[PDB]
Amino acid sequence: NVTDLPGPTNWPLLGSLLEIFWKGGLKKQHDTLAEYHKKYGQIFRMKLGSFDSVHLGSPSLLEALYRTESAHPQRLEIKPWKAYRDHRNEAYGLMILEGQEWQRVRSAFQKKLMKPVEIMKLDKKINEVLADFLERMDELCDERGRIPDLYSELNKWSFESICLVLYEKRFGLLQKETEEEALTFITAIKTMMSTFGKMMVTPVELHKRLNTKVWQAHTLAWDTIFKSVKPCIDNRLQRYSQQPGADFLCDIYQQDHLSKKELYAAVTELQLAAVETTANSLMWILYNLSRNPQAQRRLLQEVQSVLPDNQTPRAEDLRNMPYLKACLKESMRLTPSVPFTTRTLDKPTVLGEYALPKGTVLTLNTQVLGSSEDNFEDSHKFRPERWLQKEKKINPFAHLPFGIGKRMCIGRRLAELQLHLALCWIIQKYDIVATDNEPVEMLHLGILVPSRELPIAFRPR
Ligand code: HEM
Ligand SMILES: OC[C@@H]1O[C@@H](OCCCCCC2CCCCC2)[C@@H](O)[C@@H](O)[C@H]1O[C@@H]1O[C@H](CO)[C@@H](O)[C@H](O)[C@@H]1O
Ligand SMILES: OC[C@@H]1O[C@@H](OCCCCCC2CCCCC2)[C@@H](O)[C@@H](O)[C@H]1O[C@@H]1O[C@H](CO)[C@@H](O)[C@H](O)[C@@H]1O
């Protein structure tokens, strides 16, 4: 068939853009899609307005796509960012780069942020950050052990951290009398990150022509952002000019031939695609911990066994902490920072008892895979163990917080590194206890963030 989908009644003009609201709206989209999947099975499809797409929610369909993968996979078109690059005449980046052009840049970095021997080498820099972060932590801690604006806090950490990795400089976000251009560049990011959203459901080209107030905002946001990044990536190059092998950036710029104009673009989308996501999972892991004392116990122990005394962690030991590394796992399978990624076919393909029309929009509901009762017994349970007892099962195509395919998360490594170190110093110097036992809903706003302030307390030892 072709119209056997099935899916939710196709109600006039809107499509399912009805229930989607008469159920919570966009911020609860992941939930309702989760139900349809429960309903209409492994695969179906819906149309929000004139937007049509088919949802994939199974380990089968996932391999049944991984294998049929193309050389240049591609997700939805982020036209607004593209619009800006063309307008202002700037390069593109792995988020929007395409086909050959993409594959080129990917390879160059891809081969350096996903190679342990290299990533692990970030070792100290991260700790330097982790250091000042905790040093500031107890200061923010009141006496109940709580932090006001935790997310905001963890975001500062992840920002400051990744920029030490990218521009090789501290921005001073972790302590007063050190902000200013720190936050203008931050706002620029925050403004830009909300505005572009509006030129997606609306004709960016139309906007541009009318020079709409919104077009101008987004423009300026990015105009600024590129002005904050450029010099940072010019100092890093002028500094490791005659020192081959040293700077991973300067090495790409020279023996992978890429223009400063391309590096600027690539780095920036790296930062953008980094920070919040990172911070976001860090917070959900903490949260899950605060709700499972036993598992936090078995975790503390493993952090004392491998680190007797309050000594500083180091990339490596992680090899000796299978419960922690898998705590971060299960955490992501129960509370994913990212619910789903999207793909575009560029050749008709086979899925379900169906075959897709080529050029179709696919929404890989990588979330739902977490409750696949056939791969996860008691899906609604935080069990860092299932990922350890080597008697288990779990086909890699059931847990994919970083996306499947070769156009999957390029950060994954360095992300997990950071989410492994910080989490050591945390569970080290602090106990993580629940401030309360009342409901906390996940809300899609780019990445599942929580409905309210996280009810978790940081009591010292
Ligand atoms: C807990 C942290 C993170 C999660 C869960 C995560 C999530 C993902 C996911 C699910 C994708 C989509 C994959 C697909 O197309 O199927 C993605 C793409 C990507 N991520 Fe992350 N990410 C995180 C951190 C990082 C970090 C720290 C960086 C930056 C160095 C990074 C940068 C990117 C980039 C540049 C892409 C686009 C790659 C391309 O298609 O060319 N990520 N990420
Ligand atoms: O930019 C990330 C997300 O990507 C955006 O684009 C993809 C979704 C397309 C529908 C979005 C629009 C629907 C109605 C008009 C406004 C948003 C949306 O998810 C958007 O809500 C957006 O959420 C945005 O991220 C912010 C958090 O830093 C939100 O506070 C902000 O409102 C912004 O919308
Ligand atoms: O969260 C917003 C979107 O929600 C879904 O619908 C998006 C369009 C929203 C439909 C329009 C609604 C808002 C205004 C018009 C009426 C209702 C999916 O596309 C989903 O993949 C999602 O698409 C978004 O894509 C962005 C790409 O950067 C990311 O924020 C993220 O992938 C997100 O899912």
Curated annotation (Swiss-Prot):
Question: Record's Gene Ontology CC terms?
Answer: mitochondrion
**Where on the tree of life does the source sit, at the highest rank?**
Eukaryota
CDD domains tied to this protein:
CYP24A1 (cd20645)
EC class of this enzyme? oxidoreductase
Q: Which Pfam families match?
A: p450
UniProtKB keywords: Heme, Iron, Lipid metabolism, Metal-binding, Mitochondrion, Monooxygenase, Oxidoreductase, Transit peptide
The protein in question is named 1,25-dihydroxyvitamin D(3) 24-hydroxylase, mitochondrial
